[PDB]
Design a binder for this molecule. Structure first.
Ligand code: IHP
Lengths: 279, 131, 95, 60, 34, 67, 101, 121, 99
């Protein structure tokens, strides 16, 4: 490397710059496996003002590295060059193109530049789109690291509900979150996990408005709690009151009845008594 | 020789064809390709030394190449290309005429709209006087 | 030939500040933005000029444009100089 | 008169396309024609040498 | 390898001269005899 | 018969467009373009060699080919 | 209807009801209308043709010159290949003559 | 056997049928139609060059054949012109019809409003 | 890949080669030759329609129009004048063969 850089720098001290350009083009033939030589070449064309060469250099760099093994540090460099030109339509295009073929791993770099890009020009629709989609993939990284991170699931579910995301995607995210049953089987660990079910029942009741599917959320919940070791009286109470909102006292009494039968607990008795007093 | 090899991109002096090929190869190219690959460079058929045949020119009777650009085949060809274009143009014109003619036939309400106006105005002429 | 006095002259931070003040006085918003945006492009703007620019857009109530004026300022400088832009940016957004 | 109007209309479309592409395709044609002539002159030189060799072999 | 970035994105601003860029004595003897 | 209603409707339409009668019948833009597009495909398909000549001006006097 | 409706007397008319001399006037002017549209097109076509003739004539004159050269060269190659084969066959007969003499 | 192409309305030496419609075409026209429009010309469904199914299958004088080409070409161009002429007439009749309709809506609107006055005189 | 037929001397869209000669032909022309004579046209070896290898690379594209060829009737004029030369060339050959 250093031999070519010293020859280039030599011709630049004479201000030969087209002869210095010849050295770069030969340098990229031998060395061009390394991305930085292409980026330094394009920066050399840009700073002299040849900018048509600089576009050509990045576009040929992408064509050189290919379609599949996208060298995206080139792609970001290409995007940011066009951002510096005020080509910004091109700059979105390069970032947006990158997001598709790169989607999980390398986008972490794209999104930080892409979100800075949109932070000016995006302002109504472009900022909120990139930050939310950045946040979405950022929570999915946390879930791939540890599906036991309940606080990451709660913060993820907050984002999707504020999105007003399509129902089937939010159901797939709740059902992924819920499958992470605590490994300890002691109630001190379940205290955060149980609201991962309650939020799902609230979503199904209030937002999806599919009451026959909220029954299944509660039945699935109560079929998972280790009742002979401990119970969440919240679950049995909320499941009971839900059937009262369906006007089904017979179901509500059966719920509270098996609650007391499996695990007679003070919070259940108080709730059942307060219910029958209201009735 | 004027044939250009489809693989190396340079002009032959030893053109070779084989029954599973289609692009031209050099003899001095294909024999080493058979030795390393054993495989057709383009179709990936199996290659063998009995398949290759070598081309020649200048034999007795061979017609002189017409260079004048005009020819009967090329004129009949382009007249055929004119005819294909004009029929596909006429088809899309005929399609548009059919659509426009169809809806204007359906839109022929003029006589029935007029009777409704007559019915409306004759009501108005009584409604104007019963007050 | 690029004689240095006129060739430098457009790097005019005193004069760009005077020009921007007149556009606030007489320009109306859309021309004033172009002047400040060009001042950013030149890299003539001080952090005070980014904060002045945002306060202009904020006083007009183009609040969303004020946030990007800070953002573009944050791209312009580096620490310590960004610190007052971050202070104003993050509190103004937060309210 | 109706038929001639279309022949002239198609002529206009052809001429307008010809104005885009004839200047290149004629240059492309001439390049191939120059390739043929230089190949033929290469053959002419080769055979003239072969004819003169037969005279030399006979004379020898 | 044919289209994607060169053909998808849009066009930039100009066909000008930077966008055109494309890499941008002796005596003689008097003649024989004379 | 339909001919009478057709006649009266056509006659009024012609009469309303009377100032346009001297103009030739148009060629629709869709039809004009589909003629040109077919001509560019089937006749002037040698434009593939035009961009190869443009390619040669890029391959000479410029950057590295893929590896 | 498209065969029957032709203008006359500054109005659209049924062609069959007109006097014969009025049909001649109507059909004459209908003919002259179409020939006017032809002439408007033909003058434009001739204009573009005249431009193409001088624009392309240089490329054509080069091709015409190459055709004359190529015909001369290939007929020379033809005669030369004939001469090669007779002198080769004659050279065999002369070799037998050497042994005989 | 004689087979007639649905695009041209003429006999074909190479009849082809499209599975997306069951109509019969000349192979060369439909390939050019697919290569330009990508659709069945009759059913407008998606169509592609692999979907065509092939059907089974003396001279006079050269000046005579050339004069047949001349007379036949004038007939094809007469058809093309009269289609353009009839198309504009169809568009002129249509725009008049819509104008009669819209003017009738103005009348019916006008009269129906005036008919309210008799309830408030 | 530009190719020309050994029988006609014209360009061909469908080049083909006999297994018993190196020469290349337009398919419909050589098949008619085989159909009459059953032999290679140049080497005179016995030849059959299955002894052909298809040079299925991309054929020769259309020649550009002459400026007079931009209209259908002038193509018919051009086709007529072309045909008269082809006919008279064929007549000149049989005269030359007699001479
Ligand atoms: O068991 P109890 O004496 O009836 O106490 C219950 C119960 O507490 P336990 O953890 O001891 O069971 C509830 O806890 P859960 O079973 O629902 O987890 C708890 O609910 P929170 O955990 O949500 O605080 C509730 O308290 P509250 O009614 O304020 O929710 C509290 O009832 P007391 O106030 O009667 O102790």
């Amino acid at each position: 490397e250093q031999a070519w850089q010293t020859y280039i720098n030599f011709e630049l001290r004479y201000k030969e710059i087209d002869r210095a350009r010849s050295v770069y083009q030969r340098f990229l033939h031998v060395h061009g496996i390394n991305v930085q030589n292409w980026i330094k070449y394009a920066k050399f064309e840009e700073r002299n003002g040849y900018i048509g060469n600089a576009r050509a250099a990045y576009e040929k760099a992408m064509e050189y590295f290919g379609e599949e093994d996208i060298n995206e540090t080139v792609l970001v460099a290409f995007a940011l060059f066009e951002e510096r030109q005020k080509e910004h339509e091109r700059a979105r295009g390069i970032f947006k193109y990158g997001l598709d073929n790169l989607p999980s791993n390398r986008t972490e770099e794209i999104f930080k530049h892409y979100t800075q890009h949109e932070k000016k020009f995006g302002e109504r629709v472009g900022i909120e789109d990139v930050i939310i989609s950045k946040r979405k993939t950022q929570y999915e990284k946390m879930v791939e690291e540890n599906g036991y991170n309940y606080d990451a699931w709660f913060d993820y579910l907050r984002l999707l509900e504020n999105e007003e995301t399509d129902r089937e995607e939010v159901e797939d995210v709740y059902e992924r979150a819920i499958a992470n049953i605590p490994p300890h089987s002691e109630k001190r660990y379940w205290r955060r996990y149980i609201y991962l079910w309650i939020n799902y029942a609230l979503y199904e009741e209030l937002v999806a408005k599919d009451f026959d599917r909220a029954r299944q959320v509660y039945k699935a919940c109560i079929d998972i709690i280790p009742h002979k070791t401990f119970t969440f009286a919240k679950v049995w109470i909320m499941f009971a009151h839900f059937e009262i909102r369906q006007l089904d006292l017979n179901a509500a009494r059966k719920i509270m009845g098996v609650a007391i039968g499996k695990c007679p607990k003070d919070k259940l008795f108080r709730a059942y008594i307060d219910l029958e007093l209201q009735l | 020789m004027s044939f250009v090899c489809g693989i190396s991109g340079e002009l032959t002096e030893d053109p070779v064809v084989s029954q599973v090929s289609g692009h031209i190869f050099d003899r001095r190219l294909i024999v080493k390709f058979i030795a390393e690959n054993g495989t057709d460079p383009i179709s990936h058929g199996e290659l063998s030394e009995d398949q290759l045949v070598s081309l020649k020119s200048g034999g007795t009777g061979s017609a002189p190449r017409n260079v004048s650009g005009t020819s009967i085949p090329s004129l009949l060809k382009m007249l055929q290309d004119e005819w294909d274009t004009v029929m596909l143009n006429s088809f899309s014109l005929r399609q548009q005429l059919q659509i426009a003619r169809q809806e204007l036939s359906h839109s022929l309400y003029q006589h029935d709209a007029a009777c409704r106006v007559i019915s409306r105005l004759s009501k108005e002429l009584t409604a104007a006087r019963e007050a | 030939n690029m004689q240095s006095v006129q060739a430098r002259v457009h790097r005019s931070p005193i004069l760009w500040a005077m020009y921007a003040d007149y556009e606030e006085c007489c320009g109306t918003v859309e021309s004033c933005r172009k002047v400040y945006d060009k001042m950013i492009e030149l890299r003539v703007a001080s952090p005070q000029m980014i904060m002045n620019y945002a306060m202009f857009l904020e006083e007009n109530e183009y609040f969303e444009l004020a946030f990007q004026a800070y953002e573009k300022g944050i791209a312009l400088f580096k620490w310590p100089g960004v610190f007052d832009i971050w202070n104003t940016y993050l509190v103004k957004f937060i309210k | 008169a109706k038929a001639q109007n279309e022949h002239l209309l198609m002529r206009q479309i052809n001429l307008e396309l010809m104005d885009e592409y004839a200047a290149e395709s004629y240059l492309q044609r001439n390049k191939v024609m120059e390739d043929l002539l230089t190949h033929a002159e290469k053959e002419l030189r080769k055979t003239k040498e072969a004819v003169m060799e037969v005279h030399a072999n006979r004379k020898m | 390898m044919s289209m994607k970035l060169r053909d998808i994105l849009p066009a930039p601003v100009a066909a000008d001269e930077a966008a055109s860029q494309i890499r941008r004595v002796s005596k003689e003897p008097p003649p024989y005899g004379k | 018969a339909l001919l009478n209603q057709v006649f009266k409707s056509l006659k009024r339409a012609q009469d309303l467009f009377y100032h346009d009668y001297a103009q030739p019948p148009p060629m629709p833009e869709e039809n004009d373009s589909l003629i040109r597009s077919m001509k560019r495909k089937h006749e002037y398909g040698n434009v593939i060699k035009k961009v190869e000549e443009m390619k040669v001006r890029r391959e000479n006097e410029m950057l590295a080919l893929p590896t | 209807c498209t065969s029957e409706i032709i203008l006359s007397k500054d109005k659209f008319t049924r062609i069959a009801i007109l006097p014969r001399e009025e049909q001649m006037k109507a059909l004459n002017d209908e003919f002259q209308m179409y020939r006017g549209w032809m002439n408007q097109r033909a003058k434009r076509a001739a204009k573009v043709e005249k431009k193409l003739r001088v624009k392309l004539g240089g490329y054509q004159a080069i091709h015409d010159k190459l055709c004359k050269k190529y015909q001369e060269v290939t007929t020379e190659i033809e005669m030369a290949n004939i001469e090669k084969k007779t002198f080769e066959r004659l050279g065999e007969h002369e070799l037998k003559a050497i042994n005989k003499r």
